[PDB]
Amino acid sequence: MASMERFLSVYDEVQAFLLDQLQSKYEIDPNRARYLRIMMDTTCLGGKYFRGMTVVNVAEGFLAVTQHDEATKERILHDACVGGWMIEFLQAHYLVEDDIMDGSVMRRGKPCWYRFPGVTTQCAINDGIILKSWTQIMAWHYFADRPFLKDLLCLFQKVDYATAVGQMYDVTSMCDSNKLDPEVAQPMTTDFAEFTPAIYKRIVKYKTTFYTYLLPLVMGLLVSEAAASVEMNLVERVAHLIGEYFQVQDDVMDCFTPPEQLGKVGTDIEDAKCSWLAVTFLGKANAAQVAEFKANYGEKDPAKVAVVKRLYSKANLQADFAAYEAEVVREVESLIEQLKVKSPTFAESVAVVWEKTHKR
Amino acid sequence: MASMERFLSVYDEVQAFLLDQLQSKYEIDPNRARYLRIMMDTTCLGGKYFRGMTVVNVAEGFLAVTQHDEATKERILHDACVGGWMIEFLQAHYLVEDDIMDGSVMRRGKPCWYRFPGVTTQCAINDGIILKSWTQIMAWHYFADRPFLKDLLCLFQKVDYATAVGQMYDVTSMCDSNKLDPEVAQPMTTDFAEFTPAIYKRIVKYKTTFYTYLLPLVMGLLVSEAAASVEMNLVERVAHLIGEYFQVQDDVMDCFTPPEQLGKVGTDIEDAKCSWLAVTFLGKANAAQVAEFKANYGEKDPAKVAVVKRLYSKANLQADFAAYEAEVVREVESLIEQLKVKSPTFAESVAVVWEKTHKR
Ligand SMILES: COCC(=O)NCc1nc2ccccc2[nH]1
Numbered sequence: 001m002a003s004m005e006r007f008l009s010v011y012d013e014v015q016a017f018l019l020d021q022l023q024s025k026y027e028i029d030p031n032r033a034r035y036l037r038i039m040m041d042t043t044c045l046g047g048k049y050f051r052g053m054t055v056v057n058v059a060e061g062f063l064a065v066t067q068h069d070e071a072t073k074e075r076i077l078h079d080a081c082v083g084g085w086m087i088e089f090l091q092a093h094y095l096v097e098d099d100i101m102d103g104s105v106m107r108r109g110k111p112c113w114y115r116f117p118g119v120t121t122q123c124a125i126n127d128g129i130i131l132k133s134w135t136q137i138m139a140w141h142y143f144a145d146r147p148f149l150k151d152l153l154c155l156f157q158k159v160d161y162a163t164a165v166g167q168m169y170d171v172t173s174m175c176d177s178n179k180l181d182p183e184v185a186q187p188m189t190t191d192f193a194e195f196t197p198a199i200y201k202r203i204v205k206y207k208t209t210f211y212t213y214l215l216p217l218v219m220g221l222l223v224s225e226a227a228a229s230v231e232m233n234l235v236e237r238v239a240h241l242i243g244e245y246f247q248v249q250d251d252v253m254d255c256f257t258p259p260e261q262l263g264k265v266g267t268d269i270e271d272a273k274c275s276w277l278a279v280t281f282l283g284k285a286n287a288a289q290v291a292e293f294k295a296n297y298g299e300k301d302p303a304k305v306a307v308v309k310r311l312y313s314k315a316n317l318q319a320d321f322a323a324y325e326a327e328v329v330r331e332v333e334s335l336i337e338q339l340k341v342k343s344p345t346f347a348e349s350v351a352v353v354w355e356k357t358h359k360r
Numbered sequence: 361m362a363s364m365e366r367f368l369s370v371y372d373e374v375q376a377f378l379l380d381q382l383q384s385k386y387e388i389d390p391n392r393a394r395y396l397r398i399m400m401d402t403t404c405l406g407g408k409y410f411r412g413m414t415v416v417n418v419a420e421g422f423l424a425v426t427q428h429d430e431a432t433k434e435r436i437l438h439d440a441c442v443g444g445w446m447i448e449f450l451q452a453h454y455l456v457e458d459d460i461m462d463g464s465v466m467r468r469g470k471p472c473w474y475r476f477p478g479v480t481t482q483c484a485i486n487d488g489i490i491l492k493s494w495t496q497i498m499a500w501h502y503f504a505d506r507p508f509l510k511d512l513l514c515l516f517q518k519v520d521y522a523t524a525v526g527q528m529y530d531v532t533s534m535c536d537s538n539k540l541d542p543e544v545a546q547p548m549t550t551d552f553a554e555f556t557p558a559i560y561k562r563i564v565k566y567k568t569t570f571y572t573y574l575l576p577l578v579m580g581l582l583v584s585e586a587a588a589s590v591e592m593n594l595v596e597r598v599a600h601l602i603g604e605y606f607q608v609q610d611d612v613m614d615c616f617t618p619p620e621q622l623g624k625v626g627t628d629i630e631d632a633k634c635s636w637l638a639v640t641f642l643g644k645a646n647a648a649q650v651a652e653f654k655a656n657y658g659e660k661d662p663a664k665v666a667v668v669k670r671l672y673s674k675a676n677l678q679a680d681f682a683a684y685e686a687e688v689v690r691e692v693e694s695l696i697e698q699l700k701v702k703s704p705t706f707a708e709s710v711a712v713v714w715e716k717t718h719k720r
Pocket residue numbers: 024025026027515518519522570
């Protein structure tokens with residue numbers, strides 16, 4: 001059984017479980033079950049399964065070096081798939097809700113879920129709530145008697161919370177902090193004083209890294225009962241680095257990747273996002289370039305968006321990206337080495353995570 | 361210390377904990393902390409604290425009949441307040457998101473949270489996510505070493521899930537089940553075949569009863585380590601009854617309570633809600649009254665709304681409500697008696713829950 005095959009089969013099983021339970025324990029009728037099946041498929045499937053497959057890969061590594069009965073190998077791999085789906089369904093939650101929050105049009109060359117004719121925002125908000133509730137239903141069902149259940153739920157819960165806090169950092173990133181006030185409509189920053197590397201780093205760490213990198217690695221350790229093979233402060237450091245890198249790639253592609261390939265028309269400029277491009281450009285621009293960026297950023301007008309893209313093009317941001325990439329490659333290699341002291345197997349899984357990130 | 365006083369003090373403590381942790385562990389800055397404090401107050405405070413105070417009342421009952429050290433009495437009451445706030449913050453989540461889902465204008469004579477000028481939907485969806493995450497942060501913090509932690513989290517998780525399923529039943533209640541399809545925009549029912557008492561009962565049970573009645577009672581038992589004093593199938597039955605009653609009152613008031621008193625302009629008729637009024641009217645109407653209801657229900661037009669209110673007025677629904685009330689009074693009394701066999705104290709708390717519901 002290829003890992004991916006096992007992973008995909010477990011989706012089918014988990015889907016059947018959740019829908020069969022709705023019918024037998026929550027009085028659902030067949031049509032509403034079908035609507036939820038479609039919802040689940042539409043919102044959970046079609047991506048790369050990077051996060052969920054990380055859990056599987058980490059567990060697979062430990063299986064190769066640890067003595068177990070066959071049935072135990074199976075149970076561990078099944079747990080790693082369930083845990084991976086918990087993360088994918090968490091992601092699915094965040095995507096449904098974020099797309100609504102941001103008025104997004106497309107996700108993976110298909111309409112965002114709320115835009116489906118028979119969905120609408122009124123249902124989609126709640127569908128997103130259900131998606132995250134299913135992570136917990138999965139956990140309580142499949143992991144009821146597992147020794148790792150407490151630690152898994154407690155971590156999962158902190159990562160979800162961090163992610164929501166990250167969302168708040170992201171949606172408020174173009175405001176002046178000192179002006180935040182629920183009573184007063186929020187103006188866009190004029191000075192862009194908060195477009196700094198440390199501020200950017202805080203957004204990305206919370207919004208993406210905890211759930212995309214830390215949680216899949218640590219879930220893999222927890223289902224393997226292997227958290228003693230690592231120094232958790234290192235696993236955090238390496239996840240922060242790789243996660244930051246991931247987002248900087250995504251930020252560049254929002255701007256420069258053709259929409260057919262991206263699967264999306266990128267709107268970070270019109271949305272006035274604190275992107276790596278913006279922060280990096282502000283870190284090297286001259287006064288006249290800074291005034292021009294300010295006159296044009298955060299505006300729907302396509303000509304103003306083209307002015308911003310031009311400023312970025314002539315600012316030679318490809319140099320800054322190569323240098324940044326160089327330095328991340330350097331630090332990731334260093335942390336992989338430190339990880340080898342307690343676990344070659346876990347260090348190797350992080351190596352694979354990094355290769356898959358660095359080459360995508 | 362009056363119970364309410366203790367309850368309100370614990371809000372202050374919990375608020376400080378959550379905000380202090382954001383600063384010390386999640387890198388929050390002071391302005392975003394202030395925004396979340398305001399959010400928390402605006403969305404969690406100002407109601408009757410019925411659900412949270414139920415937890416406190418149930419625990420207080422057991423304290424009066426159970427031998428404990430003073431510090432243990434305090435710890436139990438503190439736990440009951442924390443558990444009660446978990447339920448109020450769960451409620452706060454659902455209200456923020458539902459108000460957004462339904463395009464609601466006012467909640468408790470104040471603007472819905474998403475309508476605040478400095479909030480907007482983009483932030484409000486996420487603020488609602490945070491509210492529910494805080495229930496879990498509270499639980500893991502205050503109840504880390506508690507013997508009831510597992511059972512409390514597992515119940516809490518099932519009630520939340522049921523509530524989301526209830527929301528789906530509610531928002532789809534004016535559609536024909538056989539027509540639900542994410543690909544096709546959903547027409548309002550023309551036949552109203554699904555406006556039945558059993559269907560209505562399913563909506564209310566899921567949408568309201570589990571979180572408003574079952575969870576506060578059972579939370580009170582769990583923090584008291586008293587679940588053996590009751591037959592859980594009875595506690596479920598009595599909660600379903602009282603919870604149904606609560607909603608039937610709310611349904612009548614949406615239609616007949618002046619907006620100043622309601623704290624809201626009621627829109628259940630324009631929203632084509634499967635209300636008790638509608639279901640009860642359809643259960644007694646003649647053919648001509650049925651055609652008239654169909655020609656007028658579920659429409660913004662104020663004259664069509666007034667036609668519906670007239671049909672309800674002349675259908676003598678006050679008689680049906682008195683008869684329904686009569687029968688609920690009868691069954692609640694019967695279940696209170698059954699509850700006395702294992703626990704007079706718990707039966708008495710349910711009596712208080714019912715009095716507070718029946719007289720509001
Ligand atoms: C077909 O069964 C209908 C029913 O009410 N079952 C029991 C039941 N449903 C619950 C939901 C949440 C928490 C606890 C619950 N217990």
